[PDB]
Amino acid sequence: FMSSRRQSVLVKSNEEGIQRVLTSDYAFLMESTTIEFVTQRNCNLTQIGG
Amino acid sequence: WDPASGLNMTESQKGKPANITDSLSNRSLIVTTILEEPYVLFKKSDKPLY
Numbered sequence: 001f002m003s004s005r006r007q008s009v010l011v012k013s014n015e016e017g018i019q020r021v022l023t024s025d026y027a028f029l030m031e032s033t034t035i036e037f038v039t040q041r042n043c044n045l046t047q048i049g050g
Numbered sequence: 051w052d053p054a055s056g057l058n059m060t061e062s063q064k065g066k067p068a069n070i071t072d073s074l075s076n077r078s079l080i081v082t083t084i085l086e087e088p089y090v091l092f093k094k095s096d097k098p099l100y
């Protein structure tokens with residue numbers, strides 16, 4: 001999927017990974033030590049899988 | 051040899067006329083193949099492919 005749409009799904013920050021989840025319908029893949037920082041200061045987000 | 055022409059060899063060496071043989075090879079095996087999904091469906095790659 002990502003090789004097809006490699007301009008729109010791929011942001012360039014961890015910040016734009018946060019914002020486009022909060023606004024769009026988007027399932028950003030972050031490193032797990034930053035998800036534990038985001039999902040404890042922004043309680044409307046979560047960590048889906050293992 | 052001739053400065054205008056070059057080497058006009060008499061390359062025939064008929065003391066032993068039969069010299070070498072070659073090898074039949076790859077031939078690339080042209081496969082007649084129509085497109086049907088999910089079998090031979092096209093790629094969504096964003097460039098021309100060869």
Ligand SMILES: *[C@@H]1O[C@H](CO)[C@@H](O[C@@H]2O[C@H](CO)[C@@H](O[C@@H]3O[C@H](CO[C@H]4O[C@H](CO)[C@@H](O)[C@H](O)[C@@H]4O)[C@@H](O)[C@H](O[C@H]4O[C@H](CO)[C@@H](O)[C@H](O)[C@@H]4O)[C@@H]3O)[C@H](O)[C@H]2NC(C)=O)[C@H](O)[C@H]1NC(C)=O
Nearest residue numbers: 051052053054055056057058059060061062063064069070
């Ligand atoms: C004596 O008389 C001759 C002819 O009357 C005059 O011309 C010289 O002799 C021949 C005929 O023109 C020339 O030989 C050719 O030279 C080519 C060299 O390629 C280039 O070399 C440099 C760059 O490195 C350039 O400055 C030059 O202008 C050339 O463009 C060869 O590649 C030629 O091709 C063929 O050579 C032999 C067959 O002969 C084979 O290997 C191949 O088939 C190849 O395709 C050709 O050999 C020669 O260059 C002419 N000039 C000179 C200065 O020698 C002479 O001027 C004249 N006087 C003297 C002093 O020789």
Ligand SMILES: *[C@@H]1O[C@H](CO)[C@@H](O)[C@H](O)[C@H]1NC(C)=O
Nearest residue numbers: 021022023041042043044045
């Ligand atoms: C999550 O986002 C909504 C708007 O999308 C906002 O109203 C809400 O306050 C946010 N949650 C927290 C805990 O701030």
Ligand SMILES: *[C@@H]1O[C@H](CO)[C@@H](O)[C@H](O)[C@H]1NC(C)=O
Nearest residue numbers: 052054055056057058059060
């Ligand atoms: C080389 O010599 C042979 C013998 O007659 C003949 O093919 C011709 O004269 C020469 N070849 C070429 C290509 O000039």
